[PDB]
Write an enzyme that holds these catalytic residues in place. Structure first.
Site, PDB file in Angstrom:
ATOM      1  N   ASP A  35      25.751  30.710  67.731  1.00  0.00           N
ATOM      2  CA  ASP A  35      26.673  29.477  68.384  1.00  0.00           C
ATOM      3  C   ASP A  35      27.095  28.354  67.450  1.00  0.00           C
ATOM      4  OD1 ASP A  35      27.579  27.985  70.415  1.00  0.00           O
ATOM      5  OD2 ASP A  35      25.841  27.101  71.039  1.00  0.00           O
ATOM      6  N   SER A 199      45.048  23.507  66.153  1.00  0.00           N
ATOM      7  CA  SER A 199      45.990  24.616  66.402  1.00  0.00           C
ATOM      8  C   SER A 199      47.575  23.946  66.151  1.00  0.00           C
ATOM      9  CB  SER A 199      45.799  25.423  67.367  1.00  0.00           C
ATOM     10  OG  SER A 199      46.871  26.381  67.900  1.00  0.00           O
TER      11      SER A 199
END
Length: 330
Positions: A35, A199
């Site tokens: 994770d 992004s």
């Protein structure tokens, strides 16, 4: 040193991935959910409330000659999906794919919430976010990667998750046969403890690319792709019959649909998520309403590049003094 371990989807939907981890002496092998969105290595154990164990493999520290109670240390964590777990702490030897750390904090669960109990395939979590998020008190503990870093050939790990198929976590090296083209690196902020990056934009299907900054986290422990409501609406508007359902808890679409791809930007590079990766199947057994793999982050407080996005790429988690993220197509 290096390590290399195969990671395997837990079910036919790629809801999560498990990776075998050796703990203790002699080794006890547990299948952990790696994770990158959390920083605790915790396991089902001989200390877990018996009624909360349903098929998981447990760590028994009393059977490990290298286990030592970390006296006074406790832990307690709550995840973005509302699940939680807590307990006490041992140090022990932990190996992943041939890479060994001695003295790793292994957090033994005394209590776990129902979603963990109900998932017999996940024996615990291995956190790979930054150690500043580790919940052990009163002495915070380091992640497996943080403990291994100095020994690694290069201070990196990579995630290569499969679509309906096994993939690989590598530690300490970049497998140049595992991706196509070049790896594009992008800046990381560690201010929230995550692998947080920006992004450069998105496209829906064959549509034009929209240049827009989307801050979010690379999170192998989250199944889906959570993005701003504007982006998610633009995606599902291209699927006839798709709608956001408050009763189901997100966007659903007719199972008869063919889904468009979704592209996200990494600098000037582009990662394409095929439409099929966005299909999470019937909302309930036999339903013709299917659950979408791109969902709004509006209720989370952060955008999350979960497995739906990451499995479309070869992803480098660069833990150099200034951390960065790398993405390549594959």
């Amino acid at each position: 040193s290096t390590g290399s371990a195969t990671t395997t989807p837990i079910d036919s939907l790629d809801d999560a991935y498990i990776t075998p981890v050796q703990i203790g002496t002699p080794a006890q092998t547990l299948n952990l959910d790696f994770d990158t969105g959390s920083s605790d290595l915790w396991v089902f154990s001989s200390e877990t409330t018996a009624s909360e164990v349903d098929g998981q493999t447990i760590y028994t520290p009393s059977k490990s000659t290298t286990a030592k109670l970390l006296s006074g240390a406790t832990w307690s964590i709550s995840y973005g999906d509302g699940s939680s777990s807590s307990g006490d702490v041992y140090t022990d030897t932990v190996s992943v794919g041939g890479l060994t750390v001695t003295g790793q904090a292994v957090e033994s669960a005394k209590k776990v919430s129902s979603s963990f109990t109900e998932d017999s395939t996940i024996d615990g979590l291995l956190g790979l976010a930054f150690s500043t998020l580790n919940t052990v008190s009163p002495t915070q503990q380091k992640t497996f990667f943080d403990n291994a870093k100095a020994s690694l050939d290069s201070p990196v790990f990579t995630a290569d998750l499969g679509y309906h198929a096994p993939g690989t976590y590598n530690f300490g090296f970049i497998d140049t046969t595992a991706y196509t083209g070049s790896i594009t690196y992008t800046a990381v902020s560690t201010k929230q403890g995550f692998w947080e990056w920006t992004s450069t934009g998105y496209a829906v299907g064959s549509g034009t690319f929209k240049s827009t900054s989307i801050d979010g986290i690379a999170d192998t422990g989250t199944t889906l792709l959570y993005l701003p409501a504007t982006v998610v609406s633009a995606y599902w508007a291209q699927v006839s019959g798709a709608k956001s359902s408050s009763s189901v808890g997100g966007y659903v679409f007719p199972c008869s649909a063919t889904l468009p791809s979704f592209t996200f930007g990494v600098g000037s590079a582009r990662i394409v998520i095929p439409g099929d990766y966005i299909d999470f199947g019937p909302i309930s057994t036999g339903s013709s309403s299917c659950f979408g793999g791109i969902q709004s982050s509006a209720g989370i407080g952060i955008n999350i590049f979960g497995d739906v996005a990451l499995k479309a790429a070869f992803v480098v988690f660069n833990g150099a003094t200034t951390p960065t993220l790398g993405f390549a197509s594959k």
